[PDB]
Amino acid sequence: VIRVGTRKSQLARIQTDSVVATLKASYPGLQFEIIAMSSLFTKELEHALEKNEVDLVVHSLKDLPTVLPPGFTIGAICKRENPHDAVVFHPKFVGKTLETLPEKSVVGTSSLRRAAQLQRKFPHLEFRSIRGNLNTRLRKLDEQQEFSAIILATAGLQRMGWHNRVGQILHPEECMYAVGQGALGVEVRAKDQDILDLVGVLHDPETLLRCIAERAFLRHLEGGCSVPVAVHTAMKDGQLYLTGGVWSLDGSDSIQETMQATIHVPAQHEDGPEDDPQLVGITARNIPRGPQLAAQNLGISLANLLLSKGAKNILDV
Numbered sequence: 683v684i685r686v687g688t689r690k691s692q693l694a695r696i697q698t699d700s701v702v703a704t705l706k707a708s709y710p711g712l713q714f715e716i717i718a719m720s721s722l723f724t725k726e727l728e729h730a731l732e733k734n735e736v737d738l739v740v741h742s743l744k745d746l747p748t749v750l751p752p753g754f755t756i757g758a759i760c761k762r763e764n765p766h767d768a769v770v771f772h773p774k775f776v777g778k779t780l781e782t783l784p785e786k787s788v789v790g791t792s793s794l795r796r797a798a799q800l801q802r803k804f805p806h807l808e809f810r811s812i813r814g815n816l817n818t819r820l821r822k823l824d825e826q827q828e829f830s831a832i833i834l835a836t837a838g839l840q841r842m843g844w845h846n847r848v849g850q851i852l853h854p855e856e857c858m859y860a861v862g863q864g865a866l867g868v869e870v871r872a873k874d875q876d877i878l879d880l881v882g883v884l885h886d887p888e889t890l891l892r893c894i895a896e897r898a899f900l901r902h903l904e905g906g907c908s909v910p911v912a913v914h915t916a917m918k919d920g921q922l923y924l925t926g927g928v929w930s931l932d933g934s935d936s937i938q939e940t941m942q943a944t945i946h947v948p949a950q951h952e953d954g955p956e957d958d959p960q961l962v963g964i965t966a967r968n969i970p971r972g973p974q975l976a977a978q979n980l981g982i983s984l985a986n987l988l989l990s991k992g993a994k995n996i997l998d999v
């Protein structure tokens with residue numbers, strides 16, 4: 683049996699089921715039991731793992747820290763869903779963008795990354811804090827008299843089935859995404875080789891590499907989930923392009939730079955050794971180590987350039 687622990691929440695459940703459906707397709711001759719428990723929530727799922735009550739936990743990659751706690755690791759980086767930030771609008775706005783929205787219009791977001799970027803880009807728009815989950819945030823926009831629009835993740839809206847509410851997908855010139863956004867991560871016990879082996883199938887090499895680069899960049903910057911650090915990655919013609927940015931809380935101050943590295947997306951897998959340290963919290967012992975190391979190096983390089991341009995001033999408000 684494969685005991686998968688999940689949060690009782692609707693978005694946590696869907697993401698969990700999606701990973702389980704892939705593992706099921708890879709391992710049809712194995713049992714999968716689902717345990718539902720309800721960073722307060724991250725902690726109790728990690729206590730179950732400790733007890734061996736569950737073997738896997740499925741999380742969003744942006745929610746995980748760059749250094750996981752002792753004895754845990756990210757066994758699988760899944761294929762990436764849309765990483766972009768999207769705008770949902772108030773019904774009264776018949777085909778508008780943030781650009782065409784009236785001046786002093788309120789925009790709901792609890793992300794400093796989004797608010798910082800969007801304040802700089804759309805200075806004539808007010809950004810207030812919105813609280814709750816997608817269904818709550820969507821109800822508040824529709825019913826209440828406060829918000830003209832709300833900023834949310836395309837991946838998240840997509841998973842709930844509510845891509846019909848996406849009004850505008852924001853591009854990197856407007857609002858670059860969070861590190862690991864649109865990617866699911868599978869947490870596992872670091873010394874359970876049998877569980878790490880199974881989860882190895884879920885690793886997508888293109889996403890894994892981009893996600894190491896992004897996590898390496900953030901770890902070097904001393905960033906985390908709730909910090910105004912944003913990134914954009916791509917892999918085209920054997921090149922990994924990493925754009926990273928740092929903003930002040932109001933967007934007034936911002937450093938943004940782009941670097942690239944010759945890194946090839948590996949088609950084939952391997953049987954790497956157990957003593958290979960996990961990179962940026964990730965265990966990809968069945969994926970070539972050459973390309974992973976290069977991705978981390980690229981992330982570090984970009985963090986080092988940003989810090990040389992005083993990126994630590996902007997962050998330490």
Ligand SMILES: *Cc1[nH]c(Cc2[nH]cc(CCC(=O)O)c2CC(=O)O)c(CCC(=O)O)c1CC(=O)O
Nearest residue numbers: 742744745792793795834835837838860863864907
């Ligand atoms: C680190 C961080 N987490 C969240 C909330 C969140 N977690 C998962 C998603 C869905 C997309 C995905 O799987 O990547 C989301 C995003 C969402 O639509 O809320 C946030 C956003 C803060 C908030 O308003 O909830 C952040 C911070 C950040 O993204 O900058």
